Amino acid sequence: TLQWKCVESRRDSKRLYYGRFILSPLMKGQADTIGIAMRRALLGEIEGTCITRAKSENNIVGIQESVHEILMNLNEIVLKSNLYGTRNALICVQGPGYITARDIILPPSVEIVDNTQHIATLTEPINLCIGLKIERNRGYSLRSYPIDAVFMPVQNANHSIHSYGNGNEKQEILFIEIWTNGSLTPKEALHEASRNLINLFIPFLHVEEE
Amino acid sequence: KVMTMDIERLLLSEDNRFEFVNSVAAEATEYVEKNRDEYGGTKKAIFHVLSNRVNDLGFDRPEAY
Amino acid sequence: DKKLGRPHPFIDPTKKKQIETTLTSDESWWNWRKPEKEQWSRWQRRRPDVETVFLKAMAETGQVKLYGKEPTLTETSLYRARRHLFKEERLQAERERLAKEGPMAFYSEWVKAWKRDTSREAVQKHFEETGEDENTQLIEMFSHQTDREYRIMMGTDVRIKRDPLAMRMKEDQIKQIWGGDPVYPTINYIQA
Amino acid sequence: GTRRGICANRYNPEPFFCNSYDAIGAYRQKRINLDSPLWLRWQLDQRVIASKEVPIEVHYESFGNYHEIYAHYLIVRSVKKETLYIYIRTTVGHISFYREIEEAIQGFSQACS
Amino acid sequence: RINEDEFHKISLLDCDFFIRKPPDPDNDVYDFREMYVTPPDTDIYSVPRVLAPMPQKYIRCAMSDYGCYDVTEPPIDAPRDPLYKSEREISKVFLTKHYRNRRLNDPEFVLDFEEIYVIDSKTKSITRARVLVTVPGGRKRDRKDDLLVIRDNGNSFKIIHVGERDDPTTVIEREEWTKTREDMEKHLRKLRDFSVSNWF
Numbered sequence: 001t002l003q004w005k006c007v008e009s010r011r012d013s014k015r016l017y018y019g020r021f022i023l024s025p026l027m028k029g030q031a032d033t034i035g036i037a038m039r040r041a042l043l044g045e046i047e048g049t050c051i052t053r054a055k056s057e058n059n060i061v062g063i064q065e066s067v068h069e070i071l072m073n074l075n076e077i078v079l080k081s082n083l084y085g086t087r088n089a090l091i092c093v094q095g096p097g098y099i100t101a102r103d104i105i106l107p108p109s110v111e112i113v114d115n116t117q118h119i120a121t122l123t124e125p126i127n128l129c130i131g132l133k134i135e136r137n138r139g140y141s142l143r144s145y146p147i148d149a150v151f152m153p154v155q156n157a158n159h160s161i162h163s164y165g166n167g168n169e170k171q172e173i174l175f176i177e178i179w180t181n182g183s184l185t186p187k188e189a190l191h192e193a194s195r196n197l198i199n200l201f202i203p204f205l206h207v208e209e210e
Numbered sequence: 211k212v213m214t215m216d217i218e219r220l221l222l223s224e225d226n227r228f229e230f231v232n233s234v235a236a237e238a239t240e241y242v243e244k245n246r247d248e249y250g251g252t253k254k255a256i257f258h259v260l261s262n263r264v265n266d267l268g269f270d271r272p273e274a275y
Numbered sequence: 276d277k278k279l280g281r282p283h284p285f286i287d288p289t290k291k292k293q294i295e296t297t298l299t300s301d302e303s304w305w306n307w308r309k310p311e312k313e314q315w316s317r318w319q320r321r322r323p324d325v326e327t328v329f330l331k332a333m334a335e336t337g338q339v340k341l342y343g344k345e346p347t348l349t350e351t352s353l354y355r356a357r358r359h360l361f362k363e364e365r366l367q368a369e370r371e372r373l374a375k376e377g378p379m380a381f382y383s384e385w386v387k388a389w390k391r392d393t394s395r396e397a398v399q400k401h402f403e404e405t406g407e408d409e410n411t412q413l414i415e416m417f418s419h420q421t422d423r424e425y426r427i428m429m430g431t432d433v434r435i436k437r438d439p440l441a442m443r444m445k446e447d448q449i450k451q452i453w454g455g456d457p458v459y460p461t462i463n464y465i466q467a
Numbered sequence: 468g469t470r471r472g473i474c475a476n477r478y479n480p481e482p483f484f485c486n487s488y489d490a491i492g493a494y495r496q497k498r499i500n501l502d503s504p505l506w507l508r509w510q511l512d513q514r515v516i517a518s519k520e521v522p523i524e525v526h527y528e529s530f531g532n533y534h535e536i537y538a539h540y541l542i543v544r545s546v547k548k549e550t551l552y553i554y555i556r557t558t559v560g561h562i563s564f565y566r567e568i569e570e571a572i573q574g575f576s577q578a579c580s
Numbered sequence: 581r582i583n584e585d586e587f588h589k590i591s592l593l594d595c596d597f598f599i600r601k602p603p604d605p606d607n608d609v610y611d612f613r614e615m616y617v618t619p620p621d622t623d624i625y626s627v628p629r630v631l632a633p634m635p636q637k638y639i640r641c642a643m644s645d646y647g648c649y650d651v652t653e654p655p656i657d658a659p660r661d662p663l664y665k666s667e668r669e670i671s672k673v674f675l676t677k678h679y680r681n682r683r684l685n686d687p688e689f690v691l692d693f694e695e696i697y698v699i700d701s702k703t704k705s706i707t708r709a710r711v712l713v714t715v716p717g718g719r720k721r722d723r724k725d726d727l728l729v730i731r732d733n734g735n736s737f738k739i740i741h742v743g744e745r746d747d748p749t750t751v752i753e754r755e756e757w758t759k760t761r762e763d764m765e766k767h768l769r770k771l772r773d774f775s776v777s778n779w780f
Binding site: 473 | 642649666669684689690734742751755756759
């Protein structure tokens, strides 16, 4: 019967989680269809969360980074949340010192993935609040600088197929590999992708009232 | 997969490629003379010689990788 | 010209260019004389190109202007170098027309059987009674689309991105790609 | 890679990616196409390729930051502080060509561990 | 001849300039009278070709290099010689006056783009940049928003408002376009019909 197992798991960085999952046995041709659909779902049907805008209402004086470099380091902030719509987070730091993802005040459903992520270095005693628009969006979807973060909880996914047992049924085995961004574990990403696929295909089974 | 890099390492180690390959053939035929276990299935005497020699180079490869 | 020869289309040589008068026949060696009758040549007739039909269709739509009524080989070579710019400009104007008109009015181009008013105002005024939102109206409109119309509409598929002009060139224009009907009639080749 | 100049704009008058995996992700999500120009932060700011060409332009801010713009890359550097970053103007194709060779070297040398 | 213990060794590609300096904690100040030029390490000196009026008083300047990169890309011998080399080639240097000779840490620190001195490696020469100002206000304008553009191999200088700054993308695009337009005309001109054709 069709069963799946987590064959490998790794945590080579706080913002790179890897997993590999076996599904077996599969009928001739099913493994590639599953892998293709699952890969599309992982790589863009998963809803992901990231910073989508930053306001710095005060090149700003006394910050070492250029403002563009601040925004580009903010893009690297990895978030996990179940937000509906947009929400506001807020950096507030008085210098001198490092501003880091730990210093984000988070809206209720959000949590930081790597609190050690850099943001800015204040070289002198100055005020730097930053007002951050956060959103949860599908990867494929879509004083106020847009950060254009690409809602990409899965950095990569792949699949491969192997025949097994030398049996003349020629049934086969699927290996799915996932590099989640740490905002999700690989097993959670696999579940989310599967469920989102089922949510895409159920509509064809919708009956409507008379 | 990786075993040919070990081969290249040993080719880089020895001062004559032909003398190296002669020494490998000698080591294999003396192995298959000093030991008479059949040792001919999924693992082969040539790969064993290469493995033992790269282990002498200190590298963590198992017998016939 | 001197200004606005950057950006927009302009005559490659500046206007007021000089012209010259040269050796007439009987001033010239026999090998450098134009013959007293124009000689027949297989090459006498301008080759029909895709780039000529497209550049004429762009000229008549006013997207471009040309030095004469027929696109020169220089102009068609430049079109060959630049056509994707005009194609993406037309596709962008098509996206913008979609955004303005809404899907009912846009896609009704390929539903001749849909006689009702498709403007956004009429779609709203129909939603305000029939309860059918814009989507149910669009599903109904497409439910009146015939298979052949749908296959023609499939040029607007977001992956195909067929040129809005190539979708709308008429037969007597497309004919000029190969240069009209073959002189030897194809009925000689047709076999059941 | 890119269409150049007259082949790219109808008249005379690009995203930034903080690393190449962000660019590949945006390509996979169809935010950008293989041919399309983009800027990659070349934080490995050694090994910049050049054609022996002087800066096509430089901008100096009054506060002494300046940007050098070239036909292939940009460098932000200041008279105080230091060079911040090179940004290389490139394509998903060029990025993939470089990355898959670097990752082939890494994949081979993985056994060196 | 002259010692270097109190000279800025402004190393260009083809030579080093020696510029006398007074003592300052930031090593930030230039004499602009005791000028010398030296082949890259030859320890021989001569007065460089001063081509412009130069300030006979100690003033403080930022310095920057107009160098190209070059990929030396040398041939590689057997001992894993590196399959690339790339090196900075400082064809030219800019020395930019500080406004009021303000120190780098002063709150009102501004570069005085009105006073740029240009050092050329290959003509072994010094010049004063004839910058053009596009900004409304002449000498009494707010200098914090000034942005200097340098162009034409560092022969052209233009002070422009900070907001105006063309994007790097549209700069590169405009240079590519103005190149390819002339290349395409130079190609199309060989056709007979070019005389009766439109840019389209």
